[PDB]
Design a protein around this nucleic acid. Sequence first.
DNA 1: ATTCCACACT
DNA 2: AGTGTGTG
Length: 428
Amino acid sequence: GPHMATGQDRVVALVDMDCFFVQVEQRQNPHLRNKPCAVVQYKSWKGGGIIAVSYEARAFGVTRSMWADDAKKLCPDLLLAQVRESRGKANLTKYREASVEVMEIMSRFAVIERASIDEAYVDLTSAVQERLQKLQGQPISADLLPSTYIEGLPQGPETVQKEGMRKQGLFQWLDSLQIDNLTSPDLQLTVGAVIVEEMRAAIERETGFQCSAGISHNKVLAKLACGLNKPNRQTLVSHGSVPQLFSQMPIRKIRSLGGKLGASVIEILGIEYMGELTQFTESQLQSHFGEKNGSWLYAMCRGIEHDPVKPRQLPKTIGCSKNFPGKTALATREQVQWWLLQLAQELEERLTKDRNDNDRVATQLVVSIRVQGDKRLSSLRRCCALTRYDAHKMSHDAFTVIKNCNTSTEWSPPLTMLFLCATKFSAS
DNA sequence: ATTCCACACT
DNA sequence: AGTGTGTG
Ligand SMILES: Nc1ncnc2c1ncn2[C@H]1C[C@H](O)[C@@H](COP(=O)(O)NP(=O)(O)OP(=O)(O)O)O1
Ligand SMILES: [Mg+2]
Ligand SMILES: [Mg+2]
């Protein structure tokens, strides 16, 4: 009763850019705007691999991981933009710089946690408290929430158009709000959504990029909410919406349950939906999935999660890798050294820029390889000191730490992947 | 022949 | 450390 926490203590948003690499390319090249379009890496093998897809192209069935030649079978007029290639590999610099544009705008509203190249979590609890004090008991107009969906509404007794439904649900929600009581979680989420509308408007005005967002009480629900009405919309998932939302929600849709652990939850417990987890005791879940996973699942299926929005706007590592599939696997010592150099040169360029922008220096170099035949993504990891931002030195050091893996002037078994990653940053 | 960050476990 | 999972 009065002592059961409900995980309604925070307001958390997740902002995720819509078809992000495609929008970067469409901003640059107006000929690509409002067209079925995709971004590809490489070109020689089957037209290149698609990594981002405009919503117009998705309507034809084009997806990420598809070869462009195959995508063109579904969508003959598909337009393509190619990722920059430097030193023999795809180079994502343009998208990292566009990401910085967006993250710097978001950081004006609140502390953000950079969760990927195109998304960040936002802890809005304080901003909401401030805005509720500014508001002075004044009701919130639907005009302040022009692109917001309230998950679960409308319910109960222009209904056949999407925007009509969005407005009906929003009206039900605002009609129900207690705009007195500044401690109401639903009111806090609603003010959060007002702020997120402002944040998304700022991103679009100042960059040209559209994005979606989720607003809820924690990161998992915010992330889930964001995807519910992409693109160019935001979704509020209230605590009270959780039981119905989760009652038909496949377990794999919840962040960190998309892989083996989620599969084992389904297999061991014989369930399909997140809500079914509520029927197990915390001890039962811990016995199957461990203390940490069990406690997390027990709270998460009730809409409760405590993972904090970490104050971290910058990546903690700077890495780059290249695959060498099938017959292209590296089979000579010289080949291995040349590609280690190419990777080290990209890494040096990125590290030097990072040191100037962010007042820090990496202190450890991590080298990872994959050998032909190994089913695992990475076969071996080794590390060494990173004492100078020098590509020739870094590539020589990586070779020194991996050369004894060579069973064999010849390299055996051939290498199917190289990976250099700078880690352990200290202030400079 | 999909390609190119963060964190748990031991 | 080094291995592995999950993410986007
Ligand atoms: N598996 C992958 N391999 C390579 N690049 C990838 C990738 N997944 C994503 N990227 C890159 C390319 C993506 O543009 C960018 C953001 O990833 P998302 O947010 O998952 N997908 P998007 O923003 O495109 O569409 P929307 O959010 O509207 O569904 O990261
Ligand atoms: Mg996105
Ligand atoms: Mg994303």
